[model samples]
Target: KEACDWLRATGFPQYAQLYEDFLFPIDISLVKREHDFLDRDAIEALCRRLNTLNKCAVMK
Candidate 1:
């Protein structure tokens, strides 16, 4: 739920389903290598968001 919330808050609501389809704290490498539907732009955006989320969690 937090993940989806974050996605929406970050203007990436379109990728909420993508979050659910995979695992939480998504692995960028895995997604980049495995995900077929996402294009380069989408993957880059998601990676950026995921990295920010990871950093926030670490700071917290």
Candidate 2:
């Protein structure tokens, strides 16, 4: 839920459900492997945002 929410908030709302259905408990490597059909730059951007958000959450 957190993952999907963050994705939507970050402008990847189109992928939120996709992530939940296919990448629940989101894994970066898995995303690259399975969703290569998606734009590479978008994937990278999403990963970067997710990583930063995750790090901040951990720090909190």
Candidate 3:
């Protein structure tokens, strides 16, 4: 359910279309990097990045 929702929520309602057009398992490397972690600012920035790529213009 989550996977399907992610595809549609991003405007690629078709799985095949998504498969052909998009990539997944986004790079969370910066947060999980050694000695690096998600601070408040980092979390906000990450959410902004996600919003920029999605249909919604809002972030929580």
Candidate 4:
């Protein structure tokens, strides 16, 4: 519910779509989570890998 909402708002159909061409499945536990147990910074860092993040691109 909330997790998917957040993911959708954060460019799931835009930036994330560039990486994932098919379906973007989720765990049931994610929708069941009421409180965030994961680290926000860690999640941000991981998400950078799933897109063409300019911050992660090389300076040529």
Give the distance in Å from residue 41's predicted Cα in candidate 1 to where it truly belongs.
0.6
Give per-residue CA lDDT, model 4, range 1-60, as digits (tens).
333345567655554443343234333235235325667674554344442333233323
Write candidate 3's Cα lDDT for 1-60 as tens digits: 354456476553654243333344334354346325547575565444443444221223
Which candidate tops TM-score? 1
Give me the candidate number with maximum lDDT. Answer: 1
User: How do the residues 5-25 of candidate 1 rate in per-residue lDDT, one tens digit apiece?
Assistant: 778887766656564444335
lDDT head-to-head 1 vs 4, winner: 1
The estimated TM-scores of all candidates read 0.45, 0.43, 0.30, 0.26
The clash count for each model shown is: 0, 0, 0, 0
Off by over 4 Å in 1: 1-26
Instruction: Report the poorest 10 consecutive residues by lDDT, candidate 4.
Output: 51-60
Cand. 1 TM to true fold: 0.45
Candidate 1 displacement at residue 10 in angstroms = 10
Candidate 3 backbone collisions, by pair: none
- Comparing candidate 2 with candidate 3, which one achieves the higher TM-score? 2
lDDT of 3: 0.43
lDDT of each: 0.64, 0.63, 0.43, 0.42
Q: What is the lDDT of residue 25 in candidate 2?
A: 39
